């Protein structure tokens, strides 16, 4: 779980290519690969603490989607309860569909 609770962005697998030599575009013979290996790219995940009802609610988010967390507190009506949750905010309050 290095994963966005808003976007769902999760780490991905990317090759890493070691290239040598002069571009053909620059009048070289063109590039060579001296290696390819796997690696992950992570989402740039950050904490967002937010106060909703009387409660302090913490999202793990891609920095990309940090705004959405604040649009998500902007629909706040029916929870005087607890914990927990809510995070009843969450998916249902995201696109609802």
């Amino acid at each position: 779980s290095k994963v966005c609770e808003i976007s769902g962005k999760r780490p991905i697998v990317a090759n890493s290519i070691q290239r040598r030599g002069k571009a053909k575009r620059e009048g070289g013979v063109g590039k060579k690969t001296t290696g390819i290996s796997k690696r992950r790219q992570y989402p740039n995940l950050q904490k967002v603490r937010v106060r909703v009802a009387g409660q302090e609610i913490t999202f793990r988010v891609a920095a990309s989607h940090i705004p959405k967390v604040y649009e998500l507190v902007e629909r706040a009506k029916g929870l005087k309860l607890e914990g927990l949750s809510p995070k009843e905010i969450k998916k249902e309050l995201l696109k609802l569909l």
Binding site: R51, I66, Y70, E71, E74
Partner: protein, 146 residues
């Protein structure tokens, strides 16, 4: 990053203004302190709503202000007093002038909005000035044998 201000901020802006600020400043200072709120079209609409309900009910003030003003520049209020001559034994105070409307001509004024500043003694042609916000002079003459 655009934000609606909920209090005057000593530059930045003052209340209700839309000023555009660094998202860091916005998210970790302004918003959580209630000093601002987001410039969302939903909340840019709420402002625009409440921008209209001010300058409406402020033309409600001026509604019945320059309304009433235009009825009271066309009226003269005559009050009889037991005057002897040019010194009233009694006096006419603001609250009196008030009753002198509610009775004679059937109109009501504050009186606390009159600007008499100590009661009328003696007599003559009087012009005082009334309120709230741009407003009317009333003309009343204090007369004799009550």
């Amino acid at each position: 990053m655009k934000v609606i201000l909920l209090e005057p901020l000593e530059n930045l802006g003052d209340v209700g203004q839309v000023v555009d600020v660094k998202p860091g400043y916005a998210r970790n200072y302004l918003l959580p302190r209630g000093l601002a709120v987001l410039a969302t079209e939903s909340n840019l609409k709420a402002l625009e709503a409440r921008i209209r309900a001010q300058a409406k009910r402020l033309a409600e003030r001026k509604a019945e202000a320059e309304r009433l003003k235009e009825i009271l520049e066309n009226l003269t209020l005559t009050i009889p007093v037991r005057a002897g001559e040019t010194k009233i034994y009694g006096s006419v105070t603001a609250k009196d002038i008030a009753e002198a409307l509610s009775r004679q001509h059937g109109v009501t004024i504050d009186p606390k909005r009159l600007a008499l500043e100590k009661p009328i003694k003696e007599l003559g042609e009087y012009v005082l000035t009334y309120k709230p916000h741009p407003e009317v002079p009333i003309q009343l003459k204090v007369s004799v044998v009550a």
